[PDB]
Design a protein around this nucleic acid. Structure first.
Lengths: 51, 52, 166, 205
RNA sequence: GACGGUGGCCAUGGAAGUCGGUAUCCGCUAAGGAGUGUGUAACAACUCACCUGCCAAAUGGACUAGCCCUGAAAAUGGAUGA
């Protein structure tokens, strides 16, 4: 089984979580900059009117 | 007030460029060492800030 | 377009794209944090309303406020009107995917929308549009005589009509 | 460098040979100190009557385009060109040419060192609150900026008015204000028919 | 003065010339890169290319090659012979 699947291309399924961070918009740009360096990607940057 | 002052300070601190030989600071739009020890390099780099 | 209902209780105009159907994003303070004066979106499905079959991707929106009211208004942009006529496969499920596909005629639909982009530039709304649109896109060729962002067609180097309406 | 502005010429030769002066009315206009963003929207009836044309290197070469017409070369023993000045060719009547640019006009924001007259209302919207802003407004007559359900540090109606115009004193108080919509239209340098010249005008006369 | 389409399409669901991928066009103009950086969450704001106002006659550049300088540091006190 191992042999069969080794010769085939084996794509990396990386264990990721979405970070529900809660901050101010002024420093979130800066915070995001460092996040980018850890192989991160933004799915959605939005504003919570209410909180 | 403060920020304006800071800029002024920088202008008399950071802005000046240095020669890759002395590391002696000439001015922020320079083309030369204007010193005889360097050998007048004319191969200047800008001075690196606290941002970089 | 101009605004549908004019902003009352001081003028309020805000700018985030709010692209695609999905998402619950609304614009009250894009330069500051979340709150402006008070919480007032209004409605989370405004994006959908604005952009149902006009785009899933880089879809602009002129967000405004009428003191706790938003009437859904878009700028009649150079991207939005051409992509409206395009097929549903390239207007759906392309949110995390590139699109450089679309060479069908879009000659009729942009003429009416040319007044909504600008109201005073001393040019023909059906003549100068064939130069300004058609040969200024990679997702909209209009007739196949034109060339997508090139110096081969659109400026009468292959075309014969250029200032005349087709 | 070495050139004209900062590059050598190959389209400013065409400004003299741009058109023939078929049109009988011309006017020197000062529409350059007002910005190009607002200048393109007012001009719809301004172009089609002869258009805004001609360079200011070719403004001295303009003299060969007056010998063709009955016009004298200089306007009134003087070409009146010591400023960012462009020629606007017109087909409108002898009375209409006096107000051809002012029929659709708008000004630019006030700069440092000048006040400028502010006739139109200043924009509004949410811009927080600041206690130090009220101390600077004590120089002015109105010391109140928060209005209606919103909150902000500048009013929805113009407090800066005509009558308060000065060289450089109250100009520093406009730098305290966060927005500058100073409307004073466009400026005619001179008015001119085809032989006779006049002063700048806004009326039919 | 440094624009309109325009927030160009994408990524985005913020990246709106300027974290960044690819195309990089047309209008209009005196002129203005789908943009040179500074800055900003990205914009905004500022500046650069680009143009023009004034002042008013020279300007710009890439090289060659004389002398000079830099390169060119070592051991008693010292050498165009002074």
């Amino acid at each position: 089984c191992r042999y069969a699947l080794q010769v085939k291309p084996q794509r990396l399924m990386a264990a990721m979580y979405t970070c529900d961070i809660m901050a101010t918009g002024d420093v979130l740009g800066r915070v995001y900059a460092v996040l980018s360096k850890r192989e991160g990607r933004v799915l959605q940057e939005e504003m919570k009117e209410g909180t | 007030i403060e920020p304006s002052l800071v800029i002024l300070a920088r202008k008399y601190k950071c802005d000046k460029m240095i020669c890759r030989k002395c590391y002696a600071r000439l001015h922020p739009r320079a083309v030369n060492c204007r010193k005889k020890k360097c050998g007048h390099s004319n191969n200047l780099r800008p001075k690196k800030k606290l941002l970089k | 377009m101009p605004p549908k209902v004019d902003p009352s209780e001081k003028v309020e105009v805000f700018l985030r794209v709010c692209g695609g159907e999905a998402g619950a994003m609304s614009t009250l303070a894009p330069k500051l944090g979340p709150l402006g004066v008070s919480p007032k979106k209004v409605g989370d499905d405004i994006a959908k309303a604005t952009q149902p079959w006009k785009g899933m991707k880089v879809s602009v929106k002129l967000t405004i406020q009428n003191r706790i009211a938003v009437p859904e208004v878009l700028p009649s942009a150079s991207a939005l009107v051409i992509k409206a006529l395009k097929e549903p496969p390239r207007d759906r499920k392309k949110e995390k995917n590139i699109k450089h596909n679309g060479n069908i005629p879009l000659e009729e639909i942009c003429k009416i929308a040319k007044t909504m982009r600008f109201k005073s530039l001393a040019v023909d709304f059906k003549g100068s549009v064939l130069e300004i649109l058609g040969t200024a896109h990679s997702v909209g060729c209009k007739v196949n005589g034109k060339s997508p962002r090139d110096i081969q067609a659109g400026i009468q180097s292959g075309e014969i009509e250029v200032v005349e309406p087709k | 460098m070495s050139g004209a502005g900062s590059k050598r010429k190959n389209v400013f030769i065409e400004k003299a040979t741009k058109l023939f002066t078929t049109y009988d009315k011309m006017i020197v206009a000062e529409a350059d100190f007002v910005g190009s963003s607002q200048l393109q929207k007012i001009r719809k009836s301004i172009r089609g009557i002869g258009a805004v044309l001609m360079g200011k290197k070719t403004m001295i070469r303009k003299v060969i385009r007056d010998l063709a017409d009955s016009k004298p070369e200089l306007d009134a023993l003087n070409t009146y060109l010591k400023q960012n000045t462009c020629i606007i060719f017109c087909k409108d009547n002898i009375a209409e040419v006096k107000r051809v640019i002012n029929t659709q006009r708008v000004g630019a924001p006030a700069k440092a060192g000048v006040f400028a007259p502010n006739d139109v209302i200043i924009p509004a919207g949410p811009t927080g609150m600041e206690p130090t802003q009220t101390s600077f407004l004590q120089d002015l007559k109105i010391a109140t900026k928060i209005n209606r359900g919103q909150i902000d540090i500048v009013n929805e109606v113009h407090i800066i008015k005509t009558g308060q115009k000065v060289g450089a004193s109250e100009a520093t108080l406009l730098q305290k204000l966060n927005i500058k919509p100073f409307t004073y239209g466009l400026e005619p340098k001179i008015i001119y028919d085809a032989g006779a010249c006049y002063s700048p005008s806004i009326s039919e006369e």
